[PDB]
Paper text:
The genomes of coronaviruses usually encode a long polypeptide which must be cleaved by main protease (alternatively named 3-chymotrypsin-like protease, 3CLpro) for maturation of several critical components of viral replication machinery. The coronaviral Mpro utilizes a catalytic dyad of conserved cysteine and histidine to cleave the peptide bond at the C-terminal side of glutamine residue. Dimerization is critical for Mpro’s protease activity, because the N-terminal residue Ser1 of one protomer is part of the substrate-binding pocket of the other protomer. Similar to other coronaviral Mpro, CCoV Mpro can be divided into three domains: domain I (residues 11–100), domain II (residues 101–198), and domain III (residues 199–299).
To further validate the inhibitory effect of [name] on CCoV Mpro at the atomic level, we determined the complex structure of CCoV Mpro_[name] to be a 2.75 Å resolution structure in the C2 space group. The asymmetric unit (A.U.) contains eight protomers of CCoV Mpro, which assemble into four functional dimers. Domains I and II adopt conserved chymotrypsin-like folds, in which the [name] binds into the cleft between them. The root mean square deviations of the eight protomers of CCoV Mpro range from 0.321 to ~0.474 Å for 231~268 Cα atom pairs, showing nearly identical conformations among them. However, the [name] bound to each protomer shows obvious structural variations, especially the P3 protecting group, suggesting that the malleability of the substrate-binding pocket of CCoV Mpro enables antiviral drug design. Interestingly, the CCoV Mpro_[name] complex structure resolved in this study showed five GC376s in the (R)-configuration and three GC376s in the (S)-configuration in the active sites of CCoV Mpro. Similar to other Mpro-[name] structures, the hydroxyl group of the (R)-hemithioacetal of [name] forms a hydrogen bond with the imidazole ring of H41 of CCoV Mpro. However, the hydroxyl group of (S)-hemithioacetal of [name] forms weak H-bonds with the backbone amide of G142 and C144 (3.9 Å and 4.0 Å, respectively) of CCoV Mpro. We found that there was a large gap between domain III of the two protomers of CCoV Mpro (distance between the Cα atoms of G281 was 7.3 Å). Instead, the equivalent R4 residues in CCoV Mpro form hydrogen bond interactions with the main chain of G126.
Author numbering:
A (entry chain B), B (entry chain A): 1 to 299
Write the structure that this text describes.
């Protein structure tokens, strides 16, 4: 059957993406109604040195912006900050505005990047939020403003707008409210990511995926308890397991129990000794339980 | 920077997928104009035993088809039988029909899967075609007639319809003209894939990606000439790198020559010494030169 990191379709989101430029700064904006949200660092004259955003807003001239979509130019009428984002009121309303809410993504939850280079939708991949509020995506010069979204029970949420990349390769963005995940600064300064807490829920779903695909070697007769585990987790940089009921269907279809895999995590966290689960030489927390159920049984 | 397997956006394609059933079989059709393409085995009374296709098609009533989108039912008037594909003429034309062409994918080449469960919305993800005309995607019961596509020069090409899974779990499909890739049969019989042959272009592309992400341990003070490598490849299940001029820019940007990388393949094909390259445990041929240049530079 196979296991692949998937994106939910880009259809509702593609038509919302605009080229936003100012001086030498070209990046991406989100166009809902008459509003256009994009990273504020697009104003700054020099983004390689510390920036004064009070100064930069004070000498902002609305005629200098070049907000565009396709062969439509959107004139700017108002520019305020909201957190690290810059909310522009533009002269047009997006005929293709979808029913949407804004939500903040939490450590362990999966979402979709529409990676856009300087105003063009480019590619869709699925990501997973790490404990320190970073993602391990693919982002370059020109992809700031690239938009993250989830679809839950018919509802479209926008959840992420791309800002920076940390010394260690990690990628940092903001919720559409304008708070940087992880509390990181919209500055070029050195910022350390700090130690990474693996999602116990997501590893369990991954191993359940392994089983459904035939890989069984990692499972013994040993079962660790929810209480035993959560204690072990607290000193081995691993989350406390939400609940056993999350995996009910998965436990049924395999005849293997969360407590059976919770022990697998412990034995494998010490090594694979050269073995691979679905071609990984190491445990993977990329996949939520929801993704595995969807991808293994179409639910 | 980072490297991910990506997909071109799906928003032209999403609205073309319908649900097609006949008897106990349910799968996906492509609705363009008044035409629904779909795999012919939708008509097989039992899809786990070898199928007499001329008998099963000889007793087929077109009224026994079900073809729906958003529980709006379309009515079948005619069909033509075209290779392993069925082409149903329906009473209604698809209002959301994108300007499209058709092409056939060659080994080495990348394309996008929209994976739909039983006409349902689905998930998007990039694949790459292996030497035997298979892919290693993610497919389950209910996902047949799921569609592959490339966007080249702003032109949408439909290129893949999904049919079956080999024992090894490789995935087989057809172009939209009903010719099945790698010549496989539309049957549950145990068909063997054949020897995988790795794309040399794609492995070089990949090592350039690693070079650009600061992973350098594989490069050495040794170059292998093109003819020299081509000899080695013929007897090691690798394609013949035809040119070097594809990699001109990656050569320039990185300072490393194709030949340095050609020699790295020969060494690394022996095995990684328990090291990794962008968290892979052996050479990767899933990324074309084009994909890497796009992803590292925005071109
Ligand atoms: C924090 C801001 C003041 C600017 C931010 N700085 C930044 O992310 O620092 C890394 C860097 C530095 C120079 C060149 C390339 C990358 C940034 O460049 N964001 C980029 C996206 C970065 C560039 C590389 N990968 C990314 O995610 C789009 O604006
Ligand atoms: C199409 O509905 C289905 C897609 C298969 C289901 C499992 N993964 C896929 O890609 N096609 C079939 O089931 C196909 C039927 C025709 C060839 C007549 N047979 C085949 O795909 O192998 C059956 C199989 C089912 C479950 C696991 C492994 C193989």
């Amino acid at each position: 059957s196979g296991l692949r990191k998937m994106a939910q379709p880009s259809g509702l989101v593609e038509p919302c993406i605009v080229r936003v430029s100012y001086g030498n700064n070209v990046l991406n904006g989100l166009w809902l109604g008459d509003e256009v949200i994009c990273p504020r660092h697009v104003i700054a004259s020099d983004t390689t040195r510390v920036i004064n955003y009070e100064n930069e807003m004070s000498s902002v001239r609305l005629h200098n912006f070049s907000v565009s979509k396709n062969n439509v130019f959107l004139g700017v009428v108002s520019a305020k900050y909201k957190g690290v984002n810059l909310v522009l009121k533009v002269n047009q309303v997006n005929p293709n505005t979808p029913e949407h809410k804004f939500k903040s993504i939490k450590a362990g939850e999966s979402f979709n990047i529409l990676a856009c280079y300087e105003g063009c939708p480019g590619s869709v991949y699925g990501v997973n939020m790490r404990s320190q509020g970073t993602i391990k995506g693919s982002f370059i010069a020109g992809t700031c403003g690239s938009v993250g979204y989830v679809l839950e029970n018919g509802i479209l949420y926008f959840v992420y707008m791309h800002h920076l990349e940390l010394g260690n390769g990690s990628h940092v963005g903001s919720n559409l409210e304008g708070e940087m995940y992880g509390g990181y600064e919209d500055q070029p300064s050195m910022q350390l990511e700090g130690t990474n807490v693996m999602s116990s829920d997501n590893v369990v779903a991954f191993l359940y995926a392994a089983l459904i695909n035939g890989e069984r070697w990692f499972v013994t007769n040993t079962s660790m308890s929810l209480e035993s585990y959560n204690t072990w987790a607290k000193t081995n940089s691993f989350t406390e397991l939400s609940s056993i009921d999350a995996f009910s269907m998965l436990a049924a279809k395999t005849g293997q129990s969360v407590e059976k895999l919770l022990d697998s995590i412990v034995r494998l966290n010490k090594g694979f000794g050269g073995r691979t689960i679905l071609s990984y030489g190491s445990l993977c927390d990329e996949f939520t339980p929801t993704e595995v159920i969807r991808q293994m049984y179409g639910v």
